[PDB]
Design a protein around this ligand. Structure first.
Ligand SMILES: CCN1CCCCC[C@@H](C)C[C@@H]([C@H](O)CNCc2cccc(C(C)C)c2)NC(=O)c2cccc(c2)C1=O
Length: 377
């Protein structure tokens, strides 16, 4: 019964993917951003200039107040609110209703996005990073505990405004081609993984592989960009600049601020390199790689001036809290969050990018010694 969940995600480019949900009795419909980078389920519950609707606890006969406050500060944005529980369902999801923790957002700062069409956030990661502490059971843990839904979900994030699928409870084999390749979940807090090698256009960055995971590497559907630790970011940009030096870009472009444009259909994809991320595999001394096309890390944005050109933003950013494999990395892959087996699977998505001479790929096996040394402690 996974066909009912195909295409259950929507969104606007750079503004997050959301799934429709209902909370309360009678059911109140809300669009909820899907976030593997956090673990709180929270919805707007008070007016806000960017909210078209919000959760009204007063209108829900099943609402239960927990008489405890909560706040969550993210890398970008923060909110505070009141904890409580209520009945929750996913119309284009499993045919079940669960009682789950809900943070009723009463104040927020740079959290909600104007015109994004979502009013809440579904943190899919583990209790260890839940606020106020790990005793606030995350939504997916409640779903698994209260129903027969298997302990896994998969995300098919599709590019161009955007759509995708969140298959709750399994793997939909029509959404990918080739084989699934699995990397261990290093520790169950974020969806933490270990990157063991990085190549740009086939050239090894030749850094201490610990630099790639300093101080961690996570899979984060709630972040648009690929985010890299300072030292890795500088090396990647230096290499990407050199590969595309035949064209001029303002240095604000390389900071993700100012956009670059080209005459419609003349974007010089060939001068931007492919990025290969090698991930720790399932067997001794074995890894595999996912290859990222420039169509993934050059995000198309709306044209500020006359909508004649093709304009893009550089979707790779510097991080001070480790590597973040954001939505643009996940797009074009089918990503399986196999919580039951403590692993994350990658396969080429059915909604893959269509470059002329290059193709995004998930390839293995590769031999890589001392992979454990790549993890930071
Ligand atoms: C998709 C557009 N947007 C903004 C999305 C706004 C709404 C979701 C957005 C608060 C979740 C977190 C996501 O959870 C972060 N994951 C790691 C993390 C970092 C610090 C603290 C925590 C704990 C709460 C667990 C977790 N994302 C960000 O911060 C973020 C930053 C920069 C750009 C963007 C998002 C973006 O591209």
């Amino acid at each position: 019964s996974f066909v009912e969940m195909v295409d259950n995600l929507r969104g606007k480019s750079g503004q997050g993917y959301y799934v429709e949900m209902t909370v309360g009795s009678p059911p109140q419909t809300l669009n909820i951003l899907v976030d593997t980078g956090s673990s709180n389920f929270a919805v707007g519950a008070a007016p806000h200039p960017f909210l078209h609707r919000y959760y009204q606890r007063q209108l829900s006969s099943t609402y239960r107040d927990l008489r405890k406050g909560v706040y969550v500060p993210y890398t970008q944005g923060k909110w505070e609110g009141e904890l409580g529980t209520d009945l929750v369902s996913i119309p284009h999801g499993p045919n079940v209703t669960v009682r789950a923790n809900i943070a009723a957002i009463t104040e927020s700062d740079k959290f909600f996005i104007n015109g994004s069409n979502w009013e809440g956030i579904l943190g899919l990661a583990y209790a260890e990073i839940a606020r106020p502490d790990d005793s606030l059971e995350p939504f997916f843990d409640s779903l698994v505990k209260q129903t027969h839904v298997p302990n896994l979900f998969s995300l098919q994030l599709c590019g161009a405004s955007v759509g995708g699928s969140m298959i709750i409870g399994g793997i939909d084999h029509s959404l990918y081609t080739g084989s699934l390749w699995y990397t261990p979940i290093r520790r169950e807090w974020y969806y933490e993984v270990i990157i063991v090698r990085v190549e740009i256009n086939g050239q090894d960055l030749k850094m201490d592989c610990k630099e790639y995971n300093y101080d961690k590497s996570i899979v984060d559907s709630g972040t648009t960009n690929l985010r890299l630790p300072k030292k890795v970011f500088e090396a990647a940009v230096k290499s990407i600049k050199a590969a595309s030096s035949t064209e001029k870009f303002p240095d604000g472009f390389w900071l993700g601020e100012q956009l670059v444009c080209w005459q419609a259909g003349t974007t010089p994809w060939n001068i931007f390199p492919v990025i290969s991320l090698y991930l720790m595999g399932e067997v001794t001394n074995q890894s595999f790689r996912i290859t990222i096309l420039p169509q993934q890390y050059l995000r198309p944005v709306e044209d500020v001036a006359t909508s004649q050109d093709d304009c893009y933003k550089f979707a790779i950013s510097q991080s001070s809290t480790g590597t973040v494999m954001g939505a643009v990395i996940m797009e074009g892959f089918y990503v399986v969050f196999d919580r039951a087996r403590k692993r994350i699977g990658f396969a080429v998505s059915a909604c893959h990018v269509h470059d002329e001479f290059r193709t995004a790929a998930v390839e293995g096996p590769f031999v890589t010694l001392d992979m454990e040394d790549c993890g930071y402690n």
